[PDB]
Design a binder for this molecule. Structure first.
Ligand SMILES: Nc1ncnc2c1ncn2[C@@H]1O[C@H](COP(=O)(O)OP(=O)(O)OP(=O)(O)O)[C@@H](O)[C@H]1O
Ligand SMILES: [Mg+2]
Ligand SMILES: [Mg+2]
Length: 390
């Protein structure tokens, strides 16, 4: 792969905030970015050098994108893998459709991660309604109480149903329209972390520090880096697990692997995203090379960047709920951005979305400081200010 050098066109399938941040990283290095996204008001399409407003399966637009761009990547884990393979007919596509197909499918994902030598949650695969009917109650009960999760198309905790007994499993599967699912045992979690790596076509790789992640209602709330409760041994183990997965997958791009640390201290892989990840947004303000710049470098065959963290960091997600301090049934209130910007540690990132809605990711604030405790205090003060915490 002769390197694709600055000045070239790079393609981005998906136009959310991840694609928008990719644009800034690519444009700062002198690349031009074409974003393919069906939405008029796409956050990435808004800043891209070119916006192809098209469905992800539109043949003419994929052909146009691959003709224009020397390399293409994605910011959308649920993108059709067949679209990436169609693009790969005429341009370089990083990560490959086959890699995305594994990562986007919980059944394939658990099988692949386990096959890499990495522990996953105890679970039962439910391939179909007919297959579930053939499973006896005891087989389900071994992983109960648990969570029934659709194998495809889930995000932000959607497509997941809590289940406490076999009858609830069968009713839940009908409630999910019978799609392939994984039934996972609910595990006693002590904390959650994510490993963030980038891998080049050559097999060279880089690793970020471990991120410690807190979720609210299944949605990422904040990230603390370096993970304060992860020993150097656990950090190395989680990084090595992510690199082993990426190596076996032949992955080229940025990969994020989420893990649980259980109350007994064991490390359990949860899932992986074939793309930059919300838990990696801190790298923009805290590390020499951001995850978005690694995505540029991997897809162009350029050398991977240094991951040095120059500053401890906390990322706080900003959901649309912040706009409804008097509840969702009452008028929106513009958040107090002037008071956020008055905090020395605060790095405000707003995605340009017009309509605040509850559950919608509207931006994030990174807090960097000389010490982690100062960044954490600042993130806590801002969370109270925004009514994220009491
Ligand atoms: N087996 C489990 N045991 C305990 N908690 C779990 C389990 N599976 C998921 N959770 C909790 O639910 C959160 C969301 O689950 P999961 O990662 O499967 O959903 P998602 O929609 O794919 O994720 P994301 O929030 O990254 O889009 C996990 O971070 C964890 O807090
Ligand atoms: Mg996944
Ligand atoms: Mg997750």
């Amino acid at each position: 792969h002769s390197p694709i050098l600055p000045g070239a066109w790079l393609g981005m399938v998906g136009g959310g905030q991840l694609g928008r941040m990719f644009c800034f990283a690519a444009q700062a290095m002198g690349y031009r970015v074409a974003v393919l996204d069906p939405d008029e008001n796409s956050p990435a399409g808004a800043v891209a050098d070119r916006h192809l407003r098209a469905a992800y399966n539109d043949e003419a637009s994929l052909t146009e994108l691959a003709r224009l761009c020397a390399a293409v990547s994605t910011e959308f884990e649920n993108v059709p893998a067949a679209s990436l393979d169609f693009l790969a007919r005429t341009t370089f596509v990083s990560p490959a459709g086959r890699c995305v197909a594994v990562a986007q499918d919980r059944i394939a994902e658990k099988r692949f991660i386990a096959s890499s030598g990495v522990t996953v949650a105890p679970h039962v695969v439910i391939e179909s309604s007919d297959a579930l009917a053939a499973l006896d109650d005891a087989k389900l009960e071994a992983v109960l109480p648990g969570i029934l999760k659709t194998a495809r198309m889930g995000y932000d905790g959607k497509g997941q149903i809590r289940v406490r007994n076999a009858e609830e499993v069968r009713e839940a599967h009908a409630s999910l329209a019978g799609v392939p699912c994984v039934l996972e045992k609910r595990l006693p979690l002590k904390f959650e972390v994510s490993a963030l790596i980038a891998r080049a076509a050559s097999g060279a790789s880089v690793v970020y520090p471990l991120a410690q992640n807190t979720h609210r209602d299944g949605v990422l709330s904040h990230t603390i880096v370096p993970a304060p409760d992860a020993s150097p041994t656990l950090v190395q183990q989680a990084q090595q697990a992510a690199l082993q997965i990426a190596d076996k997958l032949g992955y080229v791009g940025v990969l994020c692997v989420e893990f649980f640390i259980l109350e007994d201290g064991s490390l359990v892989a949860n899932e992986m995203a074939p793309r930059p990840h919300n838990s990696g947004h801190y790298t923009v303000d805290a590390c020499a090379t951001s995850q978005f710049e690694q995505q540029v470098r991997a897809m162009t065959g350029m050398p991977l960047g240094d991951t040095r963290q120059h500053s401890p960091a906390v990322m706080l997600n900003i959901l649309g709920d912040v706009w409804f301090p008097d509840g969702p049934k009452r008028p929106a209130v513009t958040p107090p951005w002037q008071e956020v910007a008055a905090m020395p540690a605060a790095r405000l990132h707003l995605y340009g979305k017009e309509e605040a809605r509850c559950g919608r990711k509207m931006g994030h604030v990174n807090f960097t400081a000389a010490t982690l405790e100062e960044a954490r205090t600042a993130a806590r003060d801002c969370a109270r200010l925004l009514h994220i915490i009491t």
